[PDB]
Amino acid sequence: STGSATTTPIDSLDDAYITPVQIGTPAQTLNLDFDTGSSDLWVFSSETTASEVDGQTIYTPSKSTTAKLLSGATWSISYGDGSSSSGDVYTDTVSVGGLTVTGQAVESAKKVSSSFTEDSTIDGLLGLAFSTLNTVSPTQQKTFFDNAKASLDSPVFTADLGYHAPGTYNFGFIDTTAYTGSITYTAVSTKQGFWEWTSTGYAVGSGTFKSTSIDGIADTGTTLLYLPATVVSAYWAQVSGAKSSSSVGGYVFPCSATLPSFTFGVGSARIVIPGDYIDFGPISTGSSSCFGGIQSSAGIGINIFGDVALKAAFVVFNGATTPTLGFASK
């Protein structure tokens, strides 16, 4: 089997991407944030504290003939950005782009933090990291991908995120029309539960490539590119007037700037992030200070190849017995 679904930016900045997901019988379609940095499929629901729902579409398990309470199971998750959610668990039928999993754990939110409430466009998350990170207790649950894997034509999924445009998540096949050149594969460590890999270096604009190992995670659920302070300083030094602002929470730059590109290495291959992908617009409405899309990972504890990086590539998440990651230009 295979599946193919379009993923759409939630706003004009590509702050996140939503993908329609069918849950239950008859189908209830929710728009979920596919997150290769976490491993829970959770949804706004009829159980979510009413004051914490503001415009989201909810899953109502009592209206699904295939929903079953997973008795005694609870979940609770906290994300890198400080947001959180928790609740109880159902199993139900879940379909993405025509690919169906029966008995998928659907984690129903009883509580969500303010950042989730305030984002009316995101109805929940669909985790695509390794199932070892799943938070369900006392019996850990599998991700949608882990459940689908054996049935797929090939044990892979791909992320093809657009810049200010829709893109695609495919399951079970590699669309050879969706990228240029070849796909370069690179080793993955699953030790921390992430799609963790080592970039071979970087360049800023038309500058020379610096060969240096940068360990980080491929994370579709993180908006920006978070890299070591040395790398980030070297980038922003090429933008007149750019500075790190403790009050804003990162590097800002004059909205009048033209940003240089940023290149990262994948083995001997190179992925080029155009400068415009690094512009996240005014820090507040009407400001001439703009927020940068490359930020320091210092104090996160890990480097994160988030959407800024991933949307410059066609990315293969290879879930073979020994997982690997592939990157192609597009």
UniProtKB/Swiss-Prot annotation:
<keyword id="KW-0645">Protease</keyword>
<comment type="similarity">
    <text>Belongs to the peptidase A1 family.</text>
</comment>
<feature type="disulfide bond">
    <location>
        <begin position="255"/>
        <end position="290"/>
    </location>
</feature>
<dbReference type="GO" id="GO:0006508">
    <property type="term" value="P:proteolysis"/>
</dbReference>
<protein>
    <recommendedName>
        <fullName>Endothiapepsin</fullName>
        <ecNumber>3.4.23.22</ecNumber>
    </recommendedName>
</protein>
<feature type="active site">
    <location>
        <position position="35"/>
    </location>
</feature>
<feature type="active site">
    <location>
        <position position="199"/>
    </location>
</feature>
<keyword id="KW-1015">Disulfide bond</keyword>
<keyword id="KW-0064">Aspartyl protease</keyword>
<keyword id="KW-0378">Hydrolase</keyword>
<keyword id="KW-0865">Zymogen</keyword>
<feature type="domain" description="Peptidase A1">
    <location>
        <begin position="17"/>
        <end position="328"/>
    </location>
</feature>
<keyword id="KW-0732">Signal</keyword>
<dbReference type="GO" id="GO:0004190">
    <property type="term" value="F:aspartic-type endopeptidase activity"/>
</dbReference>
